[PDB]
Design an enzyme around this catalytic site. Structure first.
Site, PDB file in Angstrom:
ATOM      1  N   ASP A   9       8.713   3.314   6.304  1.00 39.87           N
ATOM      2  CA  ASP A   9      10.003   3.249   5.626  1.00 39.87           C
ATOM      3  C   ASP A   9       9.926   2.353   4.401  1.00 39.87           C
ATOM      4  O   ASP A   9       9.974   1.133   4.520  1.00 39.87           O
ATOM      5  CB  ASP A   9      11.043   2.700   6.610  1.00 39.87           C
ATOM      6  CG  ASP A   9      12.422   2.573   6.006  1.00 39.87           C
ATOM      7  OD1 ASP A   9      12.619   3.135   4.912  1.00 39.87           O
ATOM      8  OD2 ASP A   9      13.296   1.930   6.652  1.00 39.87           O
ATOM      9  N   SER A  46      15.319   7.144 -12.917  1.00 34.70           N
ATOM     10  CA  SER A  46      14.992   8.492 -13.326  1.00 34.70           C
ATOM     11  C   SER A  46      15.604   8.783 -14.688  1.00 34.70           C
ATOM     12  O   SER A  46      16.665   8.264 -15.024  1.00 34.70           O
ATOM     13  CB  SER A  46      15.502   9.481 -12.286  1.00 34.70           C
ATOM     14  OG  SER A  46      15.350  10.817 -12.723  1.00 34.70           O
TER      15      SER A  46
END
Length: 330
Positions: A35, A199
């Site tokens: 994770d 992004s």
């Protein structure tokens, strides 16, 4: 040193991925959920409330000659999906894919929430976010990667998740045969303890690319792709019959649909998520309403590039002094 381990989807939907981890002497192998959005290595154990164990493999520290109770240390974690676990702490030898750390904090669960109990396939979590998020008290502990880093050939790990198929976590090297083209690297902020990046935009299907900054985290421990409501609405508008359902808890769509792809930007590069990666199947057994793999982050407070996005790429988690993230197509 290096390590290399195969990671395997837990079910036919890629709801999560498990990777075998050796703990203790002799080894006890548990299947952990790696994770990159958290920083605790915790396991079902011989100390876990009996009624809260249902099919998981447990760590029994008393059977490990290298286990040592970390005196006075406790841990307690609550995840974004509302699940939780807590307990005490041992140090022991932990190996992943041939890479060994001695003295790793292994957080032994005394209590786990229902969602963990109800999933027999996950024996615990192995956190790969920054150690600043680790919950051990009163002395915070380091992640497996943090402990291994100095010994690694290069201070990196990579995630190569499969679509409906096994993939690979590598530590300490970049497998240049595992991706196509070049790796595009992008800046990381560690201020919130995550692999947080920005992004450069998105496209829906064959549509034009929208240049827009989307801050979010690269999180192997989250199944879906959570993005701003504007982006998500633009995606689902291209699917006939798709709608946001408050009762179901997100966007659903007719299972008869063919989904469009979703592209996200990494600098000037582009990662394409095929439409099929966005189908998470019937909302309930036998239903013709299917759950979408792109959902709104509104009310989460952060955008999350979970498995839906990451499995479309070869992803480098670069733990150099100034960390960065790399993405390549594959």
């Amino acid at each position: 040193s290096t390590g290399s381990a195969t990671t395997t989807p837990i079910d036919s939907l890629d709801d999560a991925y498990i990777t075998p981890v050796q703990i203790g002497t002799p080894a006890q192998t548990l299947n952990l959920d790696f994770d990159t959005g958290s920083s605790d290595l915790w396991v079902f154990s011989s100390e876990t409330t009996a009624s809260e164990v249902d099919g998981q493999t447990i760590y029994t520290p008393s059977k490990s000659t290298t286990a040592k109770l970390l005196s006075g240390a406790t841990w307690s974690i609550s995840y974004g999906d509302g699940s939780s676990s807590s307990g005490d702490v041992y140090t022991d030898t932990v190996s992943v894919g041939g890479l060994t750390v001695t003295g790793q904090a292994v957080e032994s669960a005394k209590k786990v929430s229902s969602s963990f109990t109800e999933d027999s396939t996950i024996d615990g979590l192995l956190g790969l976010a920054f150690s600043t998020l680790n919950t051990v008290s009163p002395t915070q502990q380091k992640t497996f990667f943090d402990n291994a880093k100095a010994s690694l050939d290069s201070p990196v790990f990579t995630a190569d998740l499969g679509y409906h198929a096994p993939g690979t976590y590598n530590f300490g090297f970049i497998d240049t045969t595992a991706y196509t083209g070049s790796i595009t690297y992008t800046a990381v902020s560690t201020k919130q303890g995550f692999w947080e990046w920005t992004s450069t935009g998105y496209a829906v299907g064959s549509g034009t690319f929208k240049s827009t900054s989307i801050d979010g985290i690269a999180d192997t421990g989250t199944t879906l792709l959570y993005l701003p409501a504007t982006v998500v609405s633009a995606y689902w508008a291209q699917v006939s019959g798709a709608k946001s359902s408050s009762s179901v808890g997100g966007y659903v769509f007719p299972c008869s649909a063919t989904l469009p792809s979703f592209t996200f930007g990494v600098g000037s590069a582009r990662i394409v998520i095929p439409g099929d990666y966005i189908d998470f199947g019937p909302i309930s057994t036998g239903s013709s309403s299917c759950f979408g793999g792109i959902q709104s982050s509104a009310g989460i407070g952060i955008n999350i590039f979970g498995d839906v996005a990451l499995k479309a790429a070869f992803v480098v988690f670069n733990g150099a002094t100034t960390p960065t993230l790399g993405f390549a197509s594959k």
